[PDB]
């Protein structure tokens, strides 16, 4: 546990990112123990310069954010949510699409340039 609880949190969050994993946790039925409140905090320590230098899912933050405001825990009793919140993530997964297109326009605009 000595070296372990280290990676333990590491994961725990790292996966706390995916939201389902919330609802998993949620309709699972948990959210009633301050030990979660702490655990929030405990993790929450994670938001430190060193602290993330392993991390992989920069959702972690928003997680804590949400999962720091109990009201989230209140709300997430449901996956309807999971659509909505998960919907933003799917929409995000953007810049690559812009690359392919913003060029494309560059080219057309260039047709106009050559249109002169």
């Amino acid at each position: 546990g000595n070296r372990l609880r280290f990676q333990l949190e590491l994961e725990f969050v790292q996966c706390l990112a995916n939201p389902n994993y919330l609802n998993f946790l949620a309709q699972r039925g948990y959210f009633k123990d301050k030990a979660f409140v702490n655990y929030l905090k405990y993790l929450l320590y994670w938001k430190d310069p060193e602290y993330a230098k392993y991390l992989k899912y920069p959702q972690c933050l928003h997680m804590l954010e949400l999962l720091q405001y109990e009201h989230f825990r209140k709300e997430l009793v449901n996956a309807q949510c999971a659509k909505f919140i998960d919907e933003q993530q799917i929409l995000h997964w953007s810049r690559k699409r812009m690359r392919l297109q913003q060029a494309l326009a560059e080219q057309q605009q260039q047709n106009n340039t050559s249109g002169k």
């Binding site: 609802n23 949620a26 309709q27 449901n78 996956a79 909505f84």
Partner: peptide
């Protein structure tokens, strides 16, 4: 938000 058929259940997951 409620785009469609507002009703969904807390965890009846089948």
């Amino acid at each position: 938000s409620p785009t469609s058929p507002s009703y969904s259940p807390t965890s009846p997951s089948y």
